[PDB]
Amino acid sequence: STIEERVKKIIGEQLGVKQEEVTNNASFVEDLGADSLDTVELVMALEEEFDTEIPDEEAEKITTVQAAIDYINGHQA
């Protein structure tokens, strides 16, 4: 029920990959086969799960799993 593992669960389910493939340095579009609209719905899935508004100019900076984990951790608003 950690935040790191909850983020990995949303990512793996959104991009349809086993959670072993969702490593920290994994990139959404290069390592996990996500297109642009995949990343957009992934950020929305993150927002929906944790009840946080992520700005569009800041969501475009979320391109890897580690980049995702670091954002939701240092917020919770």
Binding site: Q14, L15, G16, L37, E41, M44, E53
Partner: protein, 412 residues
């Protein structure tokens, strides 16, 4: 040297079966696929039943990642489209790719994901709309996904003419092949309107049967007790191919598509259809397009929506076209078992008409306990009818207040 169009592949999902053969065998047994709805609360709804696709499993064809970007009706169309392609044994190369397209439509579209996305909008604003909203709902995305996963670069259209979509899409896939713009076309329709907005929508128009106490007996075409049509889900797909292209590659051949007719009613829908002059004009144009007489037609897969006005108007159109051989030709409404598949109804009923040419058998019109006093026609009621010498079948999709379409198939 006008090219001939022939059918080389079949695929289908229906309320009585998830393959062409299981569906066909279920219809010949008079089995009903109508059941009570349980995927949303039907308490406030006047109609609580529909023809549902049972035990649907597309996990081996469509991943769970792509299923979220697809309304149910698109998932049905892809699965049925894959079945048709696999059945045709067609090998898509880099050289023949630009000669293979699609003609697949729907009458309603992605009603389920429209509701969901609008619910997300009314609760959380436009930021909650899914980025896949548009590509997951519009009617042309069945042709979209199929042309992508098979590498089809040929002509692809999508005809949305409500319950004439299935006949129109197949007919114009054949027109595209006859014109020379394509050698192979995958054509059909797909529908999944059994949603709150779909059941509520047709229920608001008072067009749906209310026989909740007996859903399997609600769809009763040409019966004195009918009270509206029954919704049905599914998809039908055909691989239409040029005749020389098919025989050269050694292709399975079900039947030849020899006639396509179209017409408009030019009255609203609340106006009395009466004579069915539009329905008869569609059948007449298809007979001339094939160059045959109505007396050569053995089976007519009627529209037969179990509507009080629609059934009587179609019966008069059959009497007008056939005339002397009317009481002899076999007519049947498969919607008595499957329900009305709307944009896909013409697609699934074209396959039933083709299979009647192959097995020399006609599916029945169940729940026909006592017909109109105004008719003599043989509606092949209660049980299927074995037949011999059947050479031409006729598939009708009517509007009784709109567009009309008719397809004629010939054996071998």
């Amino acid at each position: 040297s006008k090219r001939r169009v022939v059918v080389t592949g079949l695929g289908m999902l229906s309320p009585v079966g998830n393959t062409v053969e299981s569906t066909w065998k279920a219809l010949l047994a008079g089995q009903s696929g109508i059941s009570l709805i349980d995927h949303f609360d039907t308490s406030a709804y006047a109609t609580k039943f529909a023809g549902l696709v049972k035990d649907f499993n597309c996990e081996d064809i469509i991943s769970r990642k792509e299923q979220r970007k697809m309304d149910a009706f698109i998932q049905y169309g892809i699965v049925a489209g894959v079945q048709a392609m696999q059945d045709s044994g067609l090998e898509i190369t880099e050289e023949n790719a630009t000669r293979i397209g699609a003609a697949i439509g729907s009458g309603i579209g992605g009603l389920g994901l429209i509701e969901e996305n609008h619910t997300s909008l009314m609760n959380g604003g436009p930021r909650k709309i899914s980025p896949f909203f548009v590509p997951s709902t519009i009617v042309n995305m069945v042709a979209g996904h199929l042309t992508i996963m098979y590498g089809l670069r040929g002509p692809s259209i999508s005809i949305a003419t409500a319950c004439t979509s299935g006949v129109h899409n197949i007919g114009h896939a054949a027109r595209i092949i006859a014109y020379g713009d394509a050698d192979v076309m995958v054509a059909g329709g797909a529908e999944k309107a059994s949603t709150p907005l779909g059941v509520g929508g047709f229920g608001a128009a008072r067009a749906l049967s209310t026989r909740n106490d007996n859903p399997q007996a609600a769809s009763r075409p040409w019966d004195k007790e009918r009270d509206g049509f029954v919704l049905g889900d599914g998809a039908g797909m055909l691989v239409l191919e040029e005749y020389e292209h098919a025989k050269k590659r050694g292709a399975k051949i079900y039947a030849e598509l020899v006639g396509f007719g179209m017409s408009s009613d030019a009255y609203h829908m609340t106006s009395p259809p009466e004579n069915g002059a539009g329905a008869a004009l569609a059948m007449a144009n298809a007979l001339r397009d094939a160059g045959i007489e109505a007396s050569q037609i053995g089976y007519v897969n009627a529209h037969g929506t179990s509507t009080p006005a629609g059934d009587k108007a179609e019966a008069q159109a059959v009497k007008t076209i056939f005339g002397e051989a009317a009481s002899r030709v076999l007519v049947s409404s498969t919607k008595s078992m499957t329900g009305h598949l709307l944009g896909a109804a013409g697609a699934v009923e074209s396959i039933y008409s083709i299979l009647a040419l192959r097995d020399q058998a006609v599916p029945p019109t169940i729940n026909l306990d006592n017909p109109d006093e105004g008719c003599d026609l043989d509606f092949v009621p209660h049980e299927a009818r074995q037949v011999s010498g059947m050479e031409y079948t006729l598939c009708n999709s009517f509007g009784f207040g709109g567009t009309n379409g008719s397809l004629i198939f010939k054996k071998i």
